[PDB]
């Protein structure tokens, strides 16, 4: 259909017709996506006003419009603007476009700010929406329950608590050897991947006590940690 009808519905003066127009647009937002792209200022204008009880909806419409056009940055920021109604994306596997975007961006910021203070996450320097999204993609990896995925996203972003906490929940000594092998990968991964001097050292030192905790543990794995830090005290 022409998108043309909707665009005129938005142009009417009174707020009442404008509010209604949103709903009809949202069911045809991906169909007619191409036409509406040209009409991005109206979508922004609706959002700015505070009369609308569909203010969240309007930001979400824009979000959609921006990713299809190909401006990925503007889309993810608009995703946290709405905040809610982002539910639809969380439970659809055909649009995880904005979510995946969120991780790429979030980690790059976090790595840079690690060097300043390593508790950057516990500060609100990170936006509060993003803090919620990051922990929920970690949760999807845990759903599949291979712990390696969970560890890998955090290893790149130089999250120090997450490396620790993952290992503590898999301390349970069902078989001591299996526990040890997931650690074997993690020690190796971190040398060849992590170059940032501070992040790497720190998780290595923590992992030494985690192996020592188990009364029975392979020591090939363990020896690597001590010689790398080269602390006689260890």
């Amino acid at each position: 259909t022409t998108a043309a009808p909707l665009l005129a519905l938005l142009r009417e003066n009174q707020d009442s017709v404008k509010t209604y127009a949103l709903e009809s647009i949202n069911n045809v937002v991906d169909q007619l996506w191409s036409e509406i792209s040209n009409e991005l200022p109206d979508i922004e204008a609706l959002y700015d006003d505070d009369t609308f009880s569909d203010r969240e909806m309007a930001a979400l419409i824009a979000s959609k419009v921006y990713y299809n056009l190909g401006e990925y940055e503007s889309a993810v920021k608009y995703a946290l603007a709405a905040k809610d109604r982002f539910d639809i994306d969380e439970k659809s596997q055909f649009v995880e476009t904005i979510v995946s975007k969120s991780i790429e961006m979030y980690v790059q910021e976090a790595s840079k700010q690690y060097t300043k203070d390593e508790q950057f996450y516990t500060k609100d320097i990170i936006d509060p929406k993003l803090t919620s999204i990051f922990e929920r993609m970690i949760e999807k990896c845990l759903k599949a329950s291979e712990l390696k995925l969970a560890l890998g996203i955090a290893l790149e972003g130089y999250r120090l608590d997450i490396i620790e906490s993952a290992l503590k929940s898999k301390l349970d000594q069902d078989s001591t050897s299996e526990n040890v092998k997931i650690i074997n990968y993690l020690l190796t991964l971190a040398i060849t991947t992590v170059t940032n001097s501070k992040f790497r050292s720190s998780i290595l030192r923590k992992s030494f006590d985690f192996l020592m905790n188990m009364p029975n543990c392979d020591y090939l794995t363990l020896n690597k940690v001590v010689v790398n830090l080269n602390d006689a005290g260890l």
């Binding site: 259909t1 022409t2 043309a4 009808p5 665009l7 005129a8 519905l9 142009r11 009417e12 003066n13 009174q14 009442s16 017709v17 209604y20």
Partner: protein, 266 residues
């Protein structure tokens, strides 16, 4: 309720119509749920679509006369896909024909020959011989004489348009003004001097004093019965020359050597 609007138009108070339209817009949500939004038509559905169109139609027409551009464009916007859909069964009317004419005349008045030709392609099959050319003929003729650039024919058509006015006057008055600016441009490149009479005759003013008045508004001085196109035109180019975009657009010969080298050495 829905009929109160139809009778408000005939009364003649077209401001009553406008004040009544925010209430009837709420009822336009209901008409929309009745129709499946253009996804299959049946005999339940043809009535429903019909009521939706009646409300819009007297609104289209009312807005035009009250020079309220916004409302007209929207109402019309809706009318367009509805009429376009489907096979004939009641999807054309006398009201359609009038509405498209008025629409095309707005586009001629904004001087947007770009959209007009495109809009004509979209419309094409419906106006070929199933509304024909009767009222729609008025802008088609009008485009033809100004492309040829016989301003004499064009002008004559608007005045003689008096016997055709039905609400056409909202585009027709404007379309005179548009003619004056196109001609005004032309006559500069040709010459520098016209007598008083000649200025009036080309631009089609009916008053000689109104001529001289227009000349000041057009930023032309007429002195001792002669235009002196010489001033402003030169002034404008000198003013245009100061701006900022500006080095690569103007093109420097210096720049040509610099750009050539870095191509090679890359």
């Amino acid at each position: 309720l829905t009929k109160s609007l139809s009778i408000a138009f005939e009364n003649g108070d077209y401001a009553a119509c406008e004040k009544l339209l925010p209430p009837i817009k709420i009822e336009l949500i209901k008409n929309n749920l009745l129709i499946p939004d253009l996804s299959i038509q049946n005999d339940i559905y043809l009535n429903d679509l019909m009521i939706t169109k009646r409300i819009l139609e007297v609104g289209a027409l009312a807005s035009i006369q009250t020079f309220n551009f916004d409302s007209f464009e929207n109402y019309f916007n809706q009318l367009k896909p509805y009429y376009f859909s489907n096979n004939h069964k009641l999807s054309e009317s006398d009201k359609k024909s009038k509405l498209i004419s008025l629409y095309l005349l707005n586009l001629l008045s904004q001087n947007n020959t770009t959209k007009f030709h495109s809009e004509l392609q979209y419309l094409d099959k419906h106006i070929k011989n199933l509304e024909d050319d009767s009222l729609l003929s008025y802008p088609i003729k009008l485009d033809r004489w100004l492309m040829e650039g016989s301003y004499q024919k064009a002008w004559d058509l608007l005045q003689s348009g008096s016997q055709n006015i039905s609400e056409f006057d909202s585009f027709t008055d404007i379309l005179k003004s548009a003619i004056r600016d196109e001609i005004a441009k032309n006559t500069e490149l040709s010459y520098d001097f016209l007598p008083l009479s000649n200025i009036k005759a080309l631009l089609f003013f009916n008053n000689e004093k109104e001529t001289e008045k227009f000349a000041l508004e057009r930023n032309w001085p007429i002195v001792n019965s002669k235009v002196y196109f010489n001033n402003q035109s030169k002034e404008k180019a000198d003013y245009e020359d100061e701006m900022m975009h500006e080095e690569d657009q103007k093109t420097n010969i210096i720049e040509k050597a610099m750009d050539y080298a870095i191509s090679i050495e890359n």
